[PDB]
């Protein structure tokens, strides 16, 4: 009943607000509609000729006419309803701010930035309306009234209303919009560093699932006034972050750790730490001079997991427990970022195992990053948060214009279809011979995962090759208009010459653009006493690639690892082929286990150690099943 | 629960009133806005020479015009909405 009453009380707050929107609409709608129509119909003049000029001259006569229902009347009433000079003292800015504060469900940016954007669209509408009114007076040949003074008084009074009665509200938290289910890792120990460049602070998170569970990141120089340098931005892409966040069939510990720092501190480094499914994360923020930019690289703080060290011996507390169901866990999906680019100072882990909702949350400087810039109207170097990849190994990744200096317009008829803004966006074009060559092999590394995005229309032939082998190719799926790919690939064993060749799928006409190529950082794990060199391949075997140690038929891999009589180890490993792991003393079986195709989760109690400890990674006596283990991890608890 | 129901009953009384304000605004707003604009634009006279005198004379012609949508119409409708007619 108390929950039903809370849902009722929320419904009432939405209804009351909708009633206040209806009041402001009744006050402001006839003026807003007329201003909009006059602004739209005079666009060329404030930006068939005799007919359009006569129709606009008649419209100008209607606009400049000094009636009770004039355009000047509608401008004044719009200003009065905006400020709150009504019958009852309510302002359109107040009801709009109350609206945005309630319907901020799937909103990218903060309450300040949304309410300020609402103020910008209305102030621009009025400013264009005064500009069309001056243009109409000049077109008719009437005396100039100078509406600059009236327009400035109207704009400044509205900005003053916003600054005094609206802006002294908000927070600056941000999290992921959606969630994803992908069976992660519990066999491994995914440690992930999220560190900024020396001159940079980290400026956002992003979660992908369409190409793969992937962490996308940005980092850039920090300008004066907690604003960020555009051209110093960049992208970094990490591997299977479902394996960093989602557990698979075993529970995962999540160190809820709201690492936060005093003012001036900017996060130059985050490490995410998941050892034995304990998702802690060490973070190091540096300090930063609010003005003149120049993040200072000397005053750092490192609150790894130790916000509870100050109060409790069990600093191993301050965590959560997510139980891995058989399809994975609701890792974030989309983007943990702030509306406009700014240094984040705090971060915390905000998972929700009640719905498996793994949620990241950092603490940004955006409130500050704007309260001093547009509130003072000096420069407002404002760039909203991005959505896709801005960085690409492909140069002219989409196209700049009329110029594909990276590419090669090998054919004359295979020109660029539009070349100037006539076919939607910039896009390459190939037909009946078409091709576009661009050498990026010098920019491709052996054996590394790369995420690919590109937009294509029609009959395109995507190629990523060195005229001898193709790293990536798509010459199918004739599509309607410029659909986007977000997939991956692994760069070749020797891609030093692989160039991109956008061609045509057939003799038809092709279109494509937005070629995104960037590395996916292979997921790296915490080190444990297993190292591949001391392995002694014992019987028709050899060391493999994925840390795998094939057992061709029979035999094993052996290597000495010293177990202690007071320490616990955790052998976590899956096999491809029926295998036998072995923890045996000189005589007895400290463990006696066989592994067919599954993982291994072993918590060994006091390992009575008489010196000789090793593991014989053997298979079974079947000729076909080459026993191929997957992940060596003997992690010492 | 009884406290939550009292807070709900107070919220309803605020909402009902805001709905009644919306009714009176729908009735009185076009008259109130026009009366206000005419009163503000004629402040010096009821308290460039040729230009403002002509611009105000055209407004005076618009104001004294005997239409269905005249200034006298907006004054009468303002009086009727104020009294409750």
XYZ file of C-alpha atoms in Angstrom:
722
model
C 0.000 0.000 0.000
C 2.840 2.487 0.851
C 4.474 1.747 -2.545
C 1.100 2.301 -4.317
C 0.752 5.635 -2.449
C 4.287 6.667 -3.563
C 3.416 5.800 -7.208
C 0.210 7.877 -6.759
C 2.216 10.819 -5.260
C 4.651 10.712 -8.264
C 1.643 10.646 -10.684
C 0.234 13.755 -8.913
C 3.566 15.617 -9.287
C 3.551 14.797 -13.055
C -0.141 15.917 -13.320
C 0.492 19.190 -11.393
C 3.395 19.995 -13.709
C 1.307 19.211 -16.833
C -1.370 21.613 -15.454
C 1.370 24.334 -15.055
C 2.553 23.633 -18.639
C -1.060 24.074 -19.794
C -1.184 27.503 -18.040
C 2.035 28.684 -19.761
C 0.875 27.271 -23.135
C -2.429 29.230 -22.781
C -0.361 32.366 -22.066
C 2.491 31.950 -24.666
C 1.234 29.769 -27.588
C -0.326 32.462 -29.953
C 2.878 34.560 -29.791
C 5.236 31.537 -30.134
C 3.383 30.220 -33.217
C 3.293 33.638 -34.979
C 6.963 34.396 -34.206
C 7.906 30.952 -35.524
C 5.912 31.343 -38.790
C 7.304 34.876 -39.434
C 10.863 33.632 -38.688
C 10.491 30.588 -41.020
C 8.883 32.576 -43.876
C 11.567 35.301 -43.904
C 14.563 32.894 -43.756
C 16.264 33.865 -47.074
C 15.879 37.591 -46.272
C 17.432 37.223 -42.743
C 20.014 34.587 -43.850
C 9.371 33.606 -59.342
C 11.466 36.399 -57.752
C 8.807 39.114 -58.492
C 6.089 36.799 -57.089
C 8.050 35.855 -53.916
C 9.150 39.488 -53.414
C 5.523 40.746 -53.724
C 4.180 38.012 -51.356
C 6.985 38.860 -48.807
C 6.392 42.661 -49.247
C 2.679 42.080 -48.385
C 3.769 39.933 -45.426
C 6.201 42.706 -44.347
C 3.311 45.263 -44.467
C 1.304 42.931 -42.187
C 4.316 42.442 -39.815
C 5.244 46.165 -39.453
C 1.640 47.336 -38.990
C 1.041 49.157 -35.661
C -2.103 47.381 -34.433
C -3.144 46.009 -31.005
C -2.520 42.529 -32.549
C 0.822 43.521 -34.154
C 4.074 41.524 -34.348
C 5.515 43.918 -31.694
C 2.549 42.962 -29.409
C 3.358 39.225 -29.836
C 7.073 39.900 -29.123
C 6.276 41.888 -25.940
C 3.760 39.240 -24.692
C 6.335 36.497 -25.399
C 8.896 38.458 -23.270
C 6.353 39.043 -20.443
C 5.300 35.336 -20.284
C 9.011 34.335 -20.327
C 9.933 36.691 -17.422
C 6.702 36.129 -15.435
C 4.966 39.482 -15.904
C 1.568 37.667 -16.139
C -1.765 37.851 -14.247
C -0.456 35.389 -11.642
C 3.363 35.572 -11.168
C 4.487 32.393 -12.933
C 7.270 32.369 -15.565
C 7.485 30.105 -18.657
C 11.129 29.468 -17.683
C 10.012 28.100 -14.272
C 7.388 25.682 -15.689
C 9.865 24.600 -18.395
C 12.590 23.960 -15.752
C 10.100 21.948 -13.668
C 9.197 19.990 -16.874
C 12.788 19.173 -17.825
C 13.554 18.133 -14.209
C 10.664 15.586 -14.339
C 11.033 14.225 -17.936
C 14.834 13.750 -17.661
C 14.420 9.945 -18.228
C 16.511 9.265 -21.385
C 18.228 12.655 -21.397
C 21.926 12.763 -22.373
C 22.946 15.913 -20.419
C 22.182 17.582 -17.099
C 19.224 19.731 -15.869
C 21.311 22.946 -16.156
C 22.282 22.162 -19.746
C 18.759 21.165 -20.770
C 17.053 24.225 -19.158
C 19.790 26.496 -20.577
C 19.288 24.888 -24.050
C 15.528 25.650 -23.655
C 16.499 29.280 -22.844
C 18.868 29.400 -25.919
C 16.161 28.218 -28.375
C 13.701 30.845 -27.068
C 16.279 33.723 -26.979
C 17.399 32.786 -30.544
C 13.717 32.730 -31.644
C 13.203 36.281 -30.264
C 16.520 37.566 -31.684
C 15.646 36.212 -35.151
C 12.153 37.752 -34.712
C 13.607 41.233 -34.025
C 15.980 40.666 -37.012
C 13.056 39.798 -39.384
C 11.178 42.857 -38.031
C 14.202 45.120 -38.934
C 14.479 43.384 -42.354
C 10.726 43.942 -43.022
C 11.004 47.672 -42.127
C 14.015 48.089 -44.470
C 12.272 46.148 -47.305
C 9.225 48.459 -47.110
C 11.435 51.601 -46.915
C 10.244 52.703 -43.456
C 12.314 54.505 -40.762
C 14.748 52.400 -38.659
C 13.480 52.092 -35.029
C 16.647 50.350 -33.656
C 15.188 47.225 -32.005
C 18.681 46.302 -30.632
C 17.975 48.121 -27.317
C 14.569 46.391 -26.843
C 15.972 42.974 -27.880
C 18.947 43.306 -25.457
C 16.605 44.378 -22.590
C 14.335 41.376 -23.319
C 17.240 38.861 -23.619
C 19.100 40.177 -20.523
C 15.918 40.225 -18.372
C 15.229 36.579 -19.294
C 18.859 35.538 -18.615
C 18.612 37.385 -15.260
C 15.344 35.448 -14.455
C 17.154 32.188 -15.330
C 20.255 33.112 -13.269
C 18.300 34.217 -10.153
C 15.179 31.992 -9.977
C 16.002 28.901 -12.076
C 19.774 28.066 -12.117
C 20.387 27.740 -8.264
C 19.248 24.074 -8.770
C 21.075 20.528 -9.848
C 23.577 17.452 -9.532
C 26.320 16.201 -11.853
C 26.053 12.402 -11.668
C 26.035 10.286 -14.814
C 25.650 6.593 -15.597
C 24.894 4.066 -18.337
C 21.573 4.371 -20.197
C 21.009 0.668 -20.865
C 22.345 -2.760 -19.968
C 23.620 -5.832 -21.779
C 23.803 -9.549 -21.019
C 26.963 -11.296 -22.205
C 28.546 -14.234 -20.380
C 31.762 -12.734 -19.030
C 34.710 -14.289 -17.218
C 35.224 -15.915 -13.854
C 38.148 -18.130 -14.929
C 40.303 -15.033 -15.510
C 41.384 -12.022 -13.470
C 40.506 -9.039 -15.691
C 42.427 -5.983 -14.533
C 41.760 -2.911 -16.675
C 43.593 0.406 -16.406
C 41.719 3.543 -17.492
C 44.547 6.080 -17.417
C 44.657 9.462 -19.097
C 47.579 10.853 -21.042
C 49.972 13.074 -19.034
C 48.303 16.287 -20.192
C 44.827 14.746 -20.152
C 42.186 13.642 -17.714
C 39.712 10.900 -18.546
C 36.595 12.494 -20.010
C 34.035 9.725 -20.356
C 33.103 6.052 -20.511
C 31.185 4.110 -23.162
C 29.935 0.518 -23.334
C 29.467 -1.417 -26.579
C 27.770 -4.747 -27.234
C 26.989 -4.536 -30.954
C 30.576 -5.227 -32.120
C 31.310 -6.964 -28.787
C 31.159 -6.139 -25.096
C 33.677 -3.294 -25.325
C 34.857 -0.311 -23.278
C 35.139 2.920 -25.254
C 37.060 5.816 -23.777
C 38.033 9.439 -24.358
C 40.825 11.656 -23.020
C 41.862 15.219 -23.804
C 43.736 18.260 -22.524
C 41.873 20.340 -19.949
C 41.518 24.005 -20.919
C 40.982 26.864 -18.463
C 37.687 26.946 -16.585
C 37.197 23.142 -16.389
C 36.505 23.035 -20.114
C 38.260 20.607 -22.419
C 40.305 20.946 -25.600
C 38.556 19.633 -28.702
C 41.531 18.645 -30.862
C 43.241 16.928 -27.915
C 40.400 14.413 -27.697
C 40.941 10.798 -28.700
C 39.499 7.314 -28.410
C 40.639 4.140 -26.682
C 38.837 0.819 -27.024
C 39.217 -2.199 -24.752
C 38.236 -5.813 -25.148
C 35.563 -8.069 -23.676
C 34.312 -5.853 -20.858
C 31.500 -8.309 -20.262
C 34.406 -10.410 -19.031
C 35.450 -7.405 -16.913
C 31.932 -6.884 -15.513
C 29.682 -9.867 -16.176
C 30.436 -13.022 -14.224
C 29.707 -16.388 -15.852
C 27.999 -19.096 -13.727
C 29.858 -17.951 -10.571
C 29.133 -14.923 -8.398
C 31.087 -11.685 -8.749
C 32.132 -9.307 -5.974
C 31.740 -5.630 -6.864
C 33.591 -3.154 -4.656
C 31.093 -0.335 -4.499
C 33.797 2.282 -4.070
C 32.739 5.907 -4.537
C 36.238 7.206 -5.151
C 35.909 10.972 -4.966
C 38.414 13.792 -4.623
C 38.281 17.424 -3.476
C 37.895 20.252 -5.957
C 40.628 20.805 -8.534
C 41.368 17.077 -8.704
C 41.003 15.454 -12.128
C 41.089 11.710 -12.740
C 44.262 10.946 -14.667
C 44.106 7.202 -13.993
C 41.580 4.506 -13.187
C 42.490 0.858 -12.736
C 39.665 -1.673 -12.660
C 40.568 -4.763 -10.666
C 38.683 -8.064 -10.827
C 40.655 -10.833 -9.097
C 38.624 -13.897 -8.074
C 35.516 -12.029 -9.296
C 36.184 -9.154 -6.873
C 35.590 -6.056 -9.015
C 37.561 -3.433 -7.153
C 39.142 -0.517 -8.917
C 42.173 1.614 -8.074
C 41.858 5.242 -9.187
C 44.467 8.009 -9.175
C 43.271 11.549 -9.812
C 45.708 14.419 -10.236
C 45.036 18.018 -9.284
C 44.309 20.678 -11.877
C 44.532 24.465 -11.936
C 40.939 25.610 -12.625
C 42.207 28.534 -14.709
C 44.846 28.471 -17.467
C 44.200 24.749 -17.830
C 47.502 23.059 -16.968
C 46.520 20.021 -14.939
C 49.232 19.812 -12.306
C 50.950 16.432 -12.407
C 52.231 16.557 -8.810
C 49.263 16.492 -6.372
C 47.719 13.039 -6.783
C 45.437 10.953 -4.599
C 44.946 7.191 -4.790
C 41.823 5.848 -3.069
C 41.974 2.333 -4.513
C 39.478 0.493 -2.295
C 40.260 2.306 0.945
C 37.284 4.523 1.728
C 36.382 1.974 4.425
C 39.995 1.598 5.605
C 39.454 4.848 7.509
C 36.690 3.287 9.628
C 36.722 -0.525 9.559
C 39.273 -3.331 9.737
C 37.149 -5.201 7.188
C 38.132 -2.883 4.342
C 37.235 -5.962 2.276
C 33.696 -4.690 2.894
C 32.182 -1.823 0.865
C 31.266 -4.137 -1.991
C 28.305 -6.048 -3.428
C 27.502 -9.546 -4.679
C 26.090 -10.210 -8.148
C 25.074 -13.816 -8.812
C 25.888 -14.839 -12.384
C 22.782 -16.305 -13.987
C 23.374 -18.571 -16.974
C 23.033 -15.867 -19.662
C 25.428 -13.341 -18.119
C 24.790 -10.244 -16.046
C 23.331 -6.846 -16.959
C 26.628 -5.125 -17.604
C 26.121 -1.490 -18.628
C 25.341 -0.808 -22.260
C 25.780 2.482 -24.061
C 27.608 5.237 -22.277
C 28.607 6.385 -18.796
C 29.419 10.015 -19.595
C 28.511 13.648 -18.885
C 26.445 15.794 -21.252
C 29.220 18.241 -22.164
C 32.908 17.446 -21.999
C 34.510 18.172 -18.628
C 36.950 16.577 -16.173
C 35.368 13.975 -13.927
C 36.659 14.087 -10.371
C 34.805 11.252 -8.646
C 33.784 7.762 -9.646
C 31.914 4.982 -7.910
C 30.694 1.475 -8.598
C 26.890 1.416 -8.601
C 25.859 -2.109 -9.613
C 22.307 -3.323 -8.920
C 22.175 -7.110 -8.552
C 18.445 -6.868 -7.825
C 18.285 -6.494 -11.614
C 21.948 -7.436 -12.285
C 22.218 -3.783 -13.341
C 25.967 -3.140 -13.500
C 26.140 0.657 -13.510
C 29.233 2.852 -13.648
C 29.053 6.384 -12.280
C 31.655 9.129 -12.343
C 31.508 12.639 -10.887
C 32.056 15.383 -13.448
C 33.010 19.055 -13.238
C 30.243 20.110 -15.644
C 28.219 22.144 -13.143
C 31.385 24.173 -12.629
C 32.417 23.798 -16.292
C 29.372 25.905 -17.225
C 28.404 28.028 -14.200
C 31.467 30.185 -14.962
C 31.377 30.232 -18.781
C 27.917 30.781 -20.275
C 26.490 32.171 -17.043
C 29.120 34.864 -17.683
C 28.805 34.614 -21.501
C 32.529 34.820 -22.283
C 33.519 32.007 -24.659
C 31.280 28.967 -24.039
C 33.511 26.347 -25.660
C 30.657 23.837 -25.486
C 30.822 20.371 -27.051
C 28.148 17.859 -26.085
C 28.944 14.232 -25.341
C 29.646 12.021 -28.378
C 27.733 8.887 -29.308
C 29.898 6.951 -31.774
C 33.534 6.774 -32.797
C 35.188 10.113 -33.555
C 38.646 8.594 -34.052
C 39.501 6.263 -36.917
C 42.650 4.818 -38.439
C 41.010 5.698 -41.756
C 41.929 9.290 -42.548
C 39.096 11.449 -43.831
C 37.155 8.788 -41.952
C 33.813 10.039 -43.216
C 35.023 12.629 -45.771
C 36.033 16.242 -45.276
C 34.627 17.658 -48.538
C 35.528 17.360 -52.252
C 38.847 15.845 -51.136
C 39.792 12.242 -50.340
C 43.559 12.744 -50.249
C 43.858 9.576 -48.199
C 41.723 7.666 -50.714
C 42.279 7.432 -54.468
C 39.595 8.468 -56.959
C 41.023 5.876 -59.327
C 38.191 6.276 -61.842
C 36.649 9.458 -63.236
C 33.076 8.129 -63.236
C 33.786 6.697 -59.756
C 33.850 10.241 -58.399
C 32.265 11.334 -55.128
C 28.507 11.215 -55.716
C 27.599 14.570 -54.181
C 30.933 16.422 -53.637
C 28.909 19.188 -51.967
C 25.981 18.619 -49.609
C 23.510 17.370 -52.240
C 23.458 13.654 -51.328
C 22.821 13.901 -47.598
C 26.195 13.550 -45.887
C 29.697 13.141 -47.275
C 30.155 9.700 -48.827
C 32.386 7.946 -51.346
C 30.896 6.670 -54.604
C 31.872 3.885 -56.996
C 30.120 2.570 -60.097
C 30.984 0.157 -62.941
C 34.716 0.230 -62.162
C 34.813 1.983 -58.822
C 37.573 1.851 -56.225
C 39.207 3.988 -53.518
C 42.678 2.979 -52.325
C 44.299 4.293 -49.146
C 47.435 2.873 -47.529
C 46.885 2.156 -43.829
C 48.992 -1.002 -43.631
C 51.729 1.046 -41.972
C 49.026 1.735 -39.348
C 48.081 -1.915 -38.691
C 49.713 -4.206 -36.128
C 50.156 -7.997 -36.168
C 47.701 -10.027 -34.078
C 45.562 -7.311 -32.485
C 41.796 -6.895 -32.285
C 40.266 -3.884 -34.040
C 36.685 -2.614 -33.937
C 35.210 -1.509 -37.264
C 32.442 0.982 -37.980
C 31.376 2.399 -41.332
C 28.276 3.698 -43.080
C 27.333 2.450 -46.548
C 24.521 2.713 -49.082
C 23.630 0.814 -52.211
C 26.062 -1.645 -53.772
C 29.408 -1.117 -51.996
C 32.503 -3.342 -51.940
C 34.413 -2.793 -48.694
C 38.011 -4.034 -48.714
C 40.892 -3.926 -46.231
C 43.740 -5.671 -48.036
C 47.290 -5.378 -49.349
C 46.230 -6.765 -52.764
C 47.247 -10.175 -51.348
C 44.961 -10.831 -48.337
C 41.971 -8.939 -46.927
C 41.651 -7.993 -43.259
C 38.053 -6.812 -43.650
C 35.539 -7.008 -46.463
C 31.854 -6.342 -47.093
C 30.334 -6.468 -50.586
C 26.812 -7.661 -49.808
C 23.511 -6.406 -48.328
C 22.368 -3.736 -50.748
C 20.728 -1.301 -48.325
C 18.376 1.669 -48.445
C 20.349 4.707 -47.251
C 23.637 4.739 -45.360
C 23.287 2.082 -42.677
C 26.010 1.760 -40.055
C 28.171 -1.251 -39.219
C 29.641 -1.681 -35.743
C 31.666 -4.906 -35.745
C 35.248 -6.035 -35.108
C 38.130 -8.001 -36.596
C 41.623 -9.172 -35.679
C 44.432 -7.499 -37.598
C 46.483 -9.896 -39.709
C 49.741 -11.667 -38.907
C 51.664 -9.175 -41.089
C 49.328 -6.298 -41.999
C 52.183 -3.875 -42.684
C 50.837 -3.266 -46.214
C 47.056 -3.620 -45.807
C 45.364 -0.697 -47.538
C 41.660 0.101 -47.739
C 39.890 -0.370 -51.085
C 36.284 0.824 -51.090
C 34.909 -0.512 -54.375
C 31.516 -1.240 -55.895
C 29.619 -4.444 -55.141
C 28.716 -4.826 -58.825
C 28.392 -2.755 -61.992
C 25.801 -0.751 -60.036
C 26.429 2.495 -58.151
C 27.867 2.381 -54.630
C 28.001 4.709 -51.643
C 29.724 4.580 -48.268
C 31.325 6.713 -45.547
C 32.339 6.980 -41.864
C 35.105 4.362 -41.944
C 36.024 3.826 -38.280
C 39.079 1.698 -37.494
C 40.642 1.565 -34.019
C 42.425 -1.001 -31.884
C 40.657 -3.076 -29.248
C 43.024 -3.466 -26.306
C 43.266 -7.184 -25.597
C 41.965 -7.871 -22.116
C 44.948 -8.237 -19.798
C 44.897 -10.071 -16.505
C 46.626 -10.045 -13.140
C 49.825 -12.126 -13.106
C 50.055 -15.466 -11.336
C 52.911 -17.894 -10.837
C 52.157 -19.747 -14.086
C 54.533 -18.675 -16.863
C 54.741 -20.539 -20.178
C 58.523 -20.815 -20.524
C 59.202 -23.257 -17.657
C 56.540 -25.601 -19.030
C 58.085 -28.916 -20.031
C 56.085 -30.188 -23.044
C 55.837 -33.911 -22.248
C 54.693 -36.029 -25.181
C 53.408 -34.983 -28.626
C 52.667 -31.436 -27.460
C 53.714 -27.810 -27.839
C 52.949 -24.431 -26.283
C 49.984 -22.689 -27.897
C 48.590 -19.229 -28.510
C 45.705 -18.543 -26.135
C 47.787 -19.792 -23.233
C 46.419 -23.151 -24.234
C 49.090 -25.915 -24.202
C 47.624 -28.436 -26.655
C 47.852 -32.115 -25.752
C 47.934 -33.851 -29.141
C 46.488 -37.212 -28.167
C 48.255 -38.155 -24.938
C 51.018 -36.570 -22.870
C 51.041 -33.448 -20.752
C 52.627 -30.134 -19.890
C 54.619 -30.024 -16.660
C 56.267 -27.160 -14.795
C 57.399 -26.710 -11.207
C 55.319 -24.325 -9.095
C 56.100 -24.169 -5.370
C 52.977 -24.471 -3.231
C 53.156 -23.470 0.432
C 51.777 -25.218 3.513
C 49.983 -22.053 4.719
C 48.846 -20.390 1.470
C 45.834 -21.032 -0.748
C 45.944 -21.220 -4.539
C 43.121 -21.057 -7.070
C 43.642 -23.054 -10.263
C 41.156 -21.649 -12.760
C 41.320 -23.085 -16.243
C 39.061 -24.420 -18.987
C 40.051 -27.070 -21.520
C 39.291 -27.866 -25.160
C 39.582 -31.650 -25.173
C 39.240 -34.149 -22.333
C 42.123 -33.383 -19.993
C 43.482 -34.234 -16.566
C 44.909 -31.610 -14.246
C 47.109 -32.836 -11.410
C 47.916 -31.418 -7.985
C 49.793 -34.349 -6.447
C 52.443 -34.525 -3.750
C 55.348 -36.977 -3.949
C 52.889 -39.799 -3.168
C 49.343 -38.530 -2.589
C 46.817 -36.645 -4.723
C 46.367 -33.175 -3.249
C 43.789 -33.018 -6.033
C 42.551 -35.766 -8.357
C 40.438 -34.223 -11.121
C 39.636 -34.762 -14.795
C 38.487 -32.011 -17.163
C 36.538 -32.825 -20.331
C 35.653 -29.501 -21.961
C 34.715 -27.284 -18.980
C 36.417 -24.834 -16.642
C 37.967 -25.631 -13.265
C 37.138 -23.849 -10.007
C 39.320 -25.182 -7.196
C 39.796 -23.683 -3.742
C 42.513 -25.809 -2.144
C 42.722 -25.676 1.649
C 46.006 -25.950 3.571
C 48.332 -27.528 0.997
C 50.615 -29.712 3.091
C 53.804 -29.152 1.113
C 56.846 -31.433 1.178
C 58.774 -29.525 -1.481
C 57.651 -31.217 -4.701
C 54.697 -29.388 -6.239
C 53.877 -29.132 -9.942
C 51.060 -29.679 -12.426
C 50.952 -32.228 -15.259
C 48.428 -30.716 -17.672
C 47.527 -34.053 -19.277
C 44.683 -35.251 -21.456
C 43.129 -38.722 -21.619
C 43.829 -41.778 -23.769
C 41.685 -40.793 -26.761
C 43.461 -40.279 -30.080
C 41.092 -37.671 -31.532
C 40.521 -35.204 -28.686
C 43.620 -33.006 -28.600
C 43.406 -31.729 -25.028
C 43.765 -27.942 -25.266
C 43.534 -26.020 -21.991
C 42.531 -22.352 -22.177
C 43.697 -20.087 -19.313
C 46.607 -20.786 -16.953
C 45.742 -19.228 -13.573
C 47.079 -20.747 -10.338
C 46.446 -17.441 -8.563
C 47.900 -17.433 -5.048
C 45.177 -16.396 -2.601
C -0.122 5.761 5.458
C -2.565 8.384 6.918
C 0.177 11.059 6.637
C 0.858 10.015 2.993
C -2.906 10.291 2.288
C -2.975 13.809 3.845
C 0.010 14.861 1.657
C -1.892 13.398 -1.348
C -5.104 15.301 -0.358
C -3.097 18.597 -0.111
C -1.520 17.882 -3.561
C -5.053 17.382 -4.999
C -6.236 20.734 -3.555
C -3.203 22.461 -5.199
C -3.914 20.626 -8.527
C -7.661 21.506 -8.460
C -6.798 25.162 -7.902
C -4.209 25.137 -10.736
C -6.950 23.664 -13.007
C -9.290 26.579 -11.963
C -6.464 29.075 -12.681
C -6.082 27.475 -16.126
C -9.844 28.010 -16.771
C -9.644 31.722 -15.831
C -6.409 32.170 -17.848
C -8.159 30.639 -20.925
C -11.023 33.117 -20.388
C -9.031 36.324 -19.489
C -5.493 36.089 -21.010
C -6.068 37.620 -24.559
C -7.779 40.692 -23.034
C -5.222 41.076 -20.182
C -2.247 40.931 -22.594
C -3.758 43.462 -25.065
C -4.826 45.883 -22.298
C -1.329 45.656 -20.809
C 0.446 46.317 -24.156
C -1.856 49.286 -25.004
C -1.354 50.709 -21.468
C 2.476 50.328 -21.650
C 2.756 51.771 -25.189
C 0.717 54.896 -24.330
C 2.485 55.730 -20.979
C 3.825 59.203 -22.015
C 0.467 60.390 -23.449
C -1.662 59.176 -20.457
C 0.895 60.330 -17.891
C 11.625 61.210 -33.588
C 8.606 63.463 -32.536
C 6.861 63.024 -35.892
C 7.903 59.355 -36.099
C 6.560 58.297 -32.677
C 3.488 60.557 -33.055
C 2.650 58.809 -36.377
C 3.447 55.298 -34.955
C 1.133 56.097 -31.934
C -1.570 57.715 -34.202
C -1.760 54.428 -36.195
C -2.079 52.565 -32.881
C -4.823 55.016 -31.785
C -6.739 54.270 -35.052
C -6.402 50.523 -34.298
C -7.558 51.032 -30.647
C -10.649 53.210 -31.425
C -11.804 51.012 -34.316
C -15.313 49.562 -33.788
C -14.758 45.895 -34.641
C -15.865 42.613 -33.010
C -12.192 42.293 -31.877
C -11.923 45.943 -30.700
C -10.261 47.347 -27.555
C -13.789 47.930 -26.127
C -14.503 44.181 -26.697
C -11.343 43.236 -24.714
C -12.307 45.680 -21.910
C -15.869 44.277 -21.670
C -14.631 40.621 -21.714
C -12.057 41.489 -19.018
C -14.918 42.952 -16.869
C -17.174 39.900 -17.495
C -14.421 37.362 -16.578
C -13.610 39.450 -13.452
C -17.274 39.532 -12.263
C -18.110 35.950 -13.347
C -20.405 36.596 -16.310
